[PDB]
Amino acid sequence: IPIGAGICASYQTSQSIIAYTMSLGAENSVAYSNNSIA
Amino acid sequence: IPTNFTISVTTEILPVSMTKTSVDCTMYICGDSTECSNLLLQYGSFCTQLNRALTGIAVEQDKNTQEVFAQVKQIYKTPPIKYFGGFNFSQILPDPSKPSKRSFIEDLLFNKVTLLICAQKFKGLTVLPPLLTDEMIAQYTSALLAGTITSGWTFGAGAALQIPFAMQMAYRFNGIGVTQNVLYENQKLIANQFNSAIGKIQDSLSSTASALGKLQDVVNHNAQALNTLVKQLSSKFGAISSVLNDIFSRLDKVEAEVQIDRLITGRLQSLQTYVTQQLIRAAEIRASANLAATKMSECVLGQSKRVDFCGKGYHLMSFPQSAPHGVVFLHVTYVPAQEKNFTTAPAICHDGKAHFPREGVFVSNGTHWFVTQRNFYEPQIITTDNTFVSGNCDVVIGIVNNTVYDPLQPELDSFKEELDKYFKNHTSP
Amino acid sequence: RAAEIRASANLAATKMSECVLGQSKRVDFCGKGYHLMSFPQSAPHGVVFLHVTYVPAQEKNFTTAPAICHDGKAHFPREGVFVSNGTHWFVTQRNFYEPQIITTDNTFVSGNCDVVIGIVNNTVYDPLQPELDSFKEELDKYFKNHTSP
Amino acid sequence: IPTNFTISVTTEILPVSMTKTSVDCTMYICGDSTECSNLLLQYGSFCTQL
Numbered sequence: 300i301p302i303g304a305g306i307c308a309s310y311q312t313s314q315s316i317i318a319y320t321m322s323l324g325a326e327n328s329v330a331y332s333n334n335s336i337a
Numbered sequence: 338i339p340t341n342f343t344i345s346v347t348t349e350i351l352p353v354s355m356t357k358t359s360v361d362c363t364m365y366i367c368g369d370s371t372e373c374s375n376l377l378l379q380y381g382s383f384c385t386q387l388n389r390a391l392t393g394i395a396v397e398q399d400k401n402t403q404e405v406f407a408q409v410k411q412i413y414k415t416p417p418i419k420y421f422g423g424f425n426f427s428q429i430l431p432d433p434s435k436p437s438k439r440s441f442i443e444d445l446l447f448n449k450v451t452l453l454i455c456a457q458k459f460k461g462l463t464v465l466p467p468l469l470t471d472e473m474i475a476q477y478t479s480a481l482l483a484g485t486i487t488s489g490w491t492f493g494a495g496a497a498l499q500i501p502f503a504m505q506m507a508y509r510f511n512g513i514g515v516t517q518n519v520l521y522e523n524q525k526l527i528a529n530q531f532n533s534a535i536g537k538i539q540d541s542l543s544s545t546a547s548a549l550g551k552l553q554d555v556v557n558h559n560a561q562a563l564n565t566l567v568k569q570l571s572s573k574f575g576a577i578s579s580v581l582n583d584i585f586s587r588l589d590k591v592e593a594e595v596q597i598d599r600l601i602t603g604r605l606q607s608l609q610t611y612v613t614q615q616l617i618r619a620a621e622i623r624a625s626a627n628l629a630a631t632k633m634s635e636c637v638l639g640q641s642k643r644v645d646f647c648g649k650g651y652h653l654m655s656f657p658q659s660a661p662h663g664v665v666f667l668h669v670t671y672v673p674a675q676e677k678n679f680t681t682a683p684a685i686c687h688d689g690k691a692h693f694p695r696e697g698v699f700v701s702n703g704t705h706w707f708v709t710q711r712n713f714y715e716p717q718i719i720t721t722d723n724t725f726v727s728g729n730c731d732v733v734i735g736i737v738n739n740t741v742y743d744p745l746q747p748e749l750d751s752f753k754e755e756l757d758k759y760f761k762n763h764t765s766p
Numbered sequence: 767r768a769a770e771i772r773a774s775a776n777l778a779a780t781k782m783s784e785c786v787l788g789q790s791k792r793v794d795f796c797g798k799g800y801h802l803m804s805f806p807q808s809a810p811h812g813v814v815f816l817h818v819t820y821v822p823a824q825e826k827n828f829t830t831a832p833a834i835c836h837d838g839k840a841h842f843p844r845e846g847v848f849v850s851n852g853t854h855w856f857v858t859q860r861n862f863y864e865p866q867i868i869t870t871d872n873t874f875v876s877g878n879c880d881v882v883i884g885i886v887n888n889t890v891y892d893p894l895q896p897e898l899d900s901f902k903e904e905l906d907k908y909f910k911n912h913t914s915p
Numbered sequence: 916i917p918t919n920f921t922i923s924v925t926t927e928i929l930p931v932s933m934t935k936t937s938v939d940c941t942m943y944i945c946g947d948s949t950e951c952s953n954l955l956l957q958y959g960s961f962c963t964q965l
């Protein structure tokens with residue numbers, strides 16, 4: 300539920316309503332080296 | 338035929354969203370007056386329509402940025418080492434020193450575009466905040482930048498695959514139409530034309546004041562419209578006064594309703610006109626945002642063959658940057674340099690059979706003949722590994738007559754002469 | 767609303783014309799990943815496209831080199847990339863793993879091998895020479911038999 | 916497999932612009948009258964927007 304300014308609300312867990320900050324996505328890294336190719 | 342090249346960086350600016358806004362049913366028309374609201378209650382359900390329209394506009398405004406900036410679902414990060422084979426990317430990667438994780442060009446864009454009047458707007462006119470804060474947009478842009486320099490164009494199609502940058506540029510040139518070797522023999526030169534050119538961008542944005550006009554016009558239009566809407570309510574509209582409390586406190590209950598009716602009709606008409614104008618502007622901004630999304634998807638995540646789409650010249654790559662209510666693309670492209678004149682022929686037949694180039698074109702410097710590429714000068718001897726034969730040479734018009742050196746002649750005669758010498762030696766015993 | 771619907775209908779017409787009647791090279795236009803084909807279907811006041819697409823599966827990381835210098839002359843791949851599993855080298859395609867021995871049918875020469883950066887050393891199994899060796903070996907054997915008595 | 920070819924020419928028409936125009940409030944609304952304009956001045960700033 301978009302509240303605004305990066306804050307979003309939801310209904311979760313014995314159950315209630317919570318408000319949190321969005322997560323853009325799962326962090327990932329790429330191994331870069333000047334003589335390697337996938 | 339050109340004999341040299343140059344690399345140019347072009348900038349492009351596109352708006353992506355306008356400022357969300359909302360209005361009040363009653364405080365604008367009948368501010369702190371009970372009787373005016375009581376009489377206004379009998380006019381139907383207009384401001385419900387106004388509220389629905391403005392809510393739709395705000396939702397669409399959020400969706401525009403959400404669609405444009407969120408084409409990757411995994412937030413990549415650049416490696417700590419910053420040696421990309423001679424290329425210098427220090428002008429676009431995020432700067433850790435600043436509390437806000439932004440690069441140099443993003444800082445310039447934010448400083449150049451500038452946003453008591455808001456306090457003056459007590460007349461039920463508010464501005465809502467956007468859903469995506471600026472830090473998240475900057476982080477999306479950083480993810481795109483870190484994904485497009487360490488994995489090529491692969492991360493836009495599936496699993497990200499690493500590859501050296503000096504090989505990615507070779508792939509890009511091979512895509513343009515010039516063989517990859519021309520990169521590996523000029524790498525130290527090419528970087529010098531890149532690292533310099535990107536620098537010239539930073540001054541240009543601060544050189545003229547009309548560079549950021551497209552982004553400034555949106556906020557200018559919004560502020561101007563709100564100011565006119567605020568200033569509209571000073572007009573009598575044919576009534577006796579523009580102050581609502583004076584009419585009630587100076588007249589009885591039998592004719593003051595006529596004048597307050599005139600005033601309420603005027604204010605309602607003005608509000609409806611404002612709503613219609615906002616609808617038109619929102620539609621225009623949505624069209625621009627769709628174009629920006631297409632540009633982001635095609636120019637950045639891959640390589641485009643559409644001429645004059647992602648920059649003048651043959652396209653090499655692009656880099657995105659954020660800006661207040663908009664996006665800025667930096668297109669790196671390739672342009673042929675000074676050229677030379679030459680004499681050419683369509684076909685060439687030696688043994689009564691015409692020959693045609695497999696890829697490239699025939700050329701002559703005045704006395705001999707060579708075969709070369711189209712976008713660069715690199716003469717080579719005509720060989721059967723370069724040409725293919727088809728039919729006779731009595732029907733093609735404009736053919737010339739010169740010998741063709743079949744590379745099979747090296748590859749076999751180099752042994753044939755030795756065999757003949759061996760036989761000649763064998764004759765004596 | 768009519769203007770908005772007209773814009774959407776024009777976009778849908780372009781989608782039908784380009785993705786269905788042919789193959790599209792525009793990235794992320796007719797579906798995520800590399801494009802193969804599309805199939806149309808109707809729906810109440812609209813159209814539905816089914817895009818078939820090709821996505822690379824699990825991958826392996828190798829060591830790569832830009833060029834190879836064998837007879838004091840650099841070599842470049844005609845189409846593909848050089849990869850090595852650790853001991854000795856091969857040339858493969860870019861979207862699939864299919865190693866092959868380095869051959870002059872796969873590489874072309876350009877200048878000397880002291881201007882390129884990062885070049886390596888390896889022998890090039892130049893194939894037209896074994897093609898002619900299929901006759902060279904028998905020539906040598908027949909000359910040995912010729913001079914034997 | 917085809918064994919021959921033909922070359923054809925197709926034509927396409929596209930509009931690019933529409934005729935410019937301009938309007939004048941005072942003469943259109945208040946025809947050669949002074950009182951009408953004097954009382955029209957009290958209606959705000961519609962004409963500037965137009």
Ligand SMILES: *[C@@H]1O[C@H](CO)[C@@H](O[C@@H]2O[C@H](CO)[C@@H](O[C@@H]3O[C@H](CO)[C@@H](O)[C@H](O)[C@@H]3O)[C@H](O)[C@H]2NC(C)=O)[C@H](O)[C@H]1NC(C)=O
Pocket residue numbers: 702703704705
């Ligand atoms: C057009 O291009 C051709 C091919 O490069 C030019 O012919 C080349 O001319 C140079 C300059 O004389 C030759 O270099 C020297 O030639 C002498 C000839 O005896 C030789 O003894 C030297 O060792 C040295 O090689 C070069 O050989 C010659 N190319 C070939 C295949 O013989 C031609 O001059 C150009 N036309 C112009 C510039 O108008």
Ligand SMILES: *[C@@H]1O[C@H](CO)[C@@H](O[C@@H]2O[C@H](CO)[C@@H](O[C@@H]3O[C@H](CO)[C@@H](O)[C@H](O)[C@@H]3O)[C@H](O)[C@H]2NC(C)=O)[C@H](O)[C@H]1NC(C)=O
Pocket residue numbers: 851852853854
């Ligand atoms: C990297 O790839 C190369 C090329 O495949 C590998 O070298 C070759 O590996 C194969 C498989 O082990 C060898 O074939 C086998 O040889 C044994 C020797 O006794 C034989 O008994 C088997 O029947 C089979 O033919 C092949 O000989 C070998 N090539 C050479 C020149 O020795 C190499 O092992 C790979 N390296 C790694 C680390 O995987």
Ligand SMILES: *[C@@H]1O[C@H](CO)[C@@H](O[C@@H]2O[C@H](CO)[C@@H](O[C@@H]3O[C@H](CO)[C@@H](O)[C@H](O)[C@@H]3O)[C@H](O)[C@H]2NC(C)=O)[C@H](O)[C@H]1NC(C)=O
Pocket residue numbers: 885886887
């Ligand atoms: C690939 O093979 C070539 C030739 O087979 C290698 O070139 C050789 O490189 C070494 C040093 O890497 C050179 O040694 C030097 O010789 C000079 C005298 O000329 C001496 O003064 C130096 O102190 C040093 O010892 C060697 O001369 C050179 N070969 C030739 C014919 O010039 C090359 O190094 C090989 N590449 C790799 C990656 O192994």
Ligand SMILES: *[C@@H]1O[C@H](CO)[C@@H](O[C@@H]2O[C@H](CO)[C@@H](O)[C@H](O)[C@H]2NC(C)=O)[C@H](O)[C@H]1NC(C)=O
Pocket residue numbers: 341342529530674
């Ligand atoms: C191709 O063009 C480049 C760019 O002009 C040339 O490099 C320049 O060479 C001159 C000397 O003639 C130097 O003064 C410049 O500083 C060089 N530019 C850079 C960016 O380093 C190059 O020489 C040209 N190549 C040929 C074969 O003419």
Ligand SMILES: *[C@@H]1O[C@H](CO)[C@@H](O[C@@H]2O[C@H](CO)[C@@H](O)[C@H](O)[C@H]2NC(C)=O)[C@H](O)[C@H]1NC(C)=O
Pocket residue numbers: 425426427428
């Ligand atoms: C990449 O470019 C940046 C920007 O020009 C370089 O940083 C500058 O380096 C010069 C070298 O003396 C200094 O005078 C400037 O003050 C530096 N500017 C900034 C903002 O740091 C950087 O050195 C370049 N990268 C490499 C590897 O040379």
Ligand SMILES: *[C@@H]1O[C@H](CO)[C@@H](O[C@@H]2O[C@H](CO)[C@@H](O)[C@H](O)[C@H]2NC(C)=O)[C@H](O)[C@H]1NC(C)=O
Pocket residue numbers: 678679
């Ligand atoms: C090669 O192309 C140039 C390009 O036009 C020809 O023109 C010469 O240079 C300028 C530019 O047109 C003209 O004003 C000169 O009059 C031309 N030179 C001469 C000597 O007339 C040039 O003639 C062409 N040369 C060849 C050998 O094809």
Ligand SMILES: *[C@@H]1O[C@H](CO)[C@@H](O[C@@H]2O[C@H](CO)[C@@H](O)[C@H](O)[C@H]2NC(C)=O)[C@H](O)[C@H]1NC(C)=O
Pocket residue numbers: 737738
């Ligand atoms: C290339 O070879 C052909 C065939 O050898 C040449 O054609 C000759 O043209 C002359 C007049 O130009 C005739 O008198 C000969 O009879 C032709 N040859 C034959 C076999 O009939 C052609 O001229 C040569 N190209 C050039 C530029 O001379």
Ligand SMILES: *[C@@H]1O[C@H](CO)[C@@H](O[C@@H]2O[C@H](CO)[C@@H](O)[C@H](O)[C@H]2NC(C)=O)[C@H](O)[C@H]1NC(C)=O
Pocket residue numbers: 918919920
């Ligand atoms: C390909 O089609 C063209 C057009 O039908 C053919 O050209 C005609 O050929 C006939 C037979 O020689 C002539 O009588 C006509 O005059 C030609 N038409 C024109 C406009 O010139 C051509 O022959 C066909 N090619 C093949 C290989 O069948």
Ligand SMILES: *[C@@H]1O[C@H](CO)[C@@H](O)[C@H](O)[C@H]1NC(C)=O
Pocket residue numbers: 333334420884
């Ligand atoms: C890769 O980069 C490192 C550090 O920049 C350097 O020491 C190394 O020589 C590079 N690799 C090659 C093959 O040049």
Ligand SMILES: *[C@@H]1O[C@H](CO)[C@@H](O)[C@H](O)[C@H]1NC(C)=O
Pocket residue numbers: 735
């Ligand atoms: C080119 O044109 C000139 C004059 O128009 C003519 O003399 C010459 O024969 C032409 N060349 C060819 C190959 O048609």
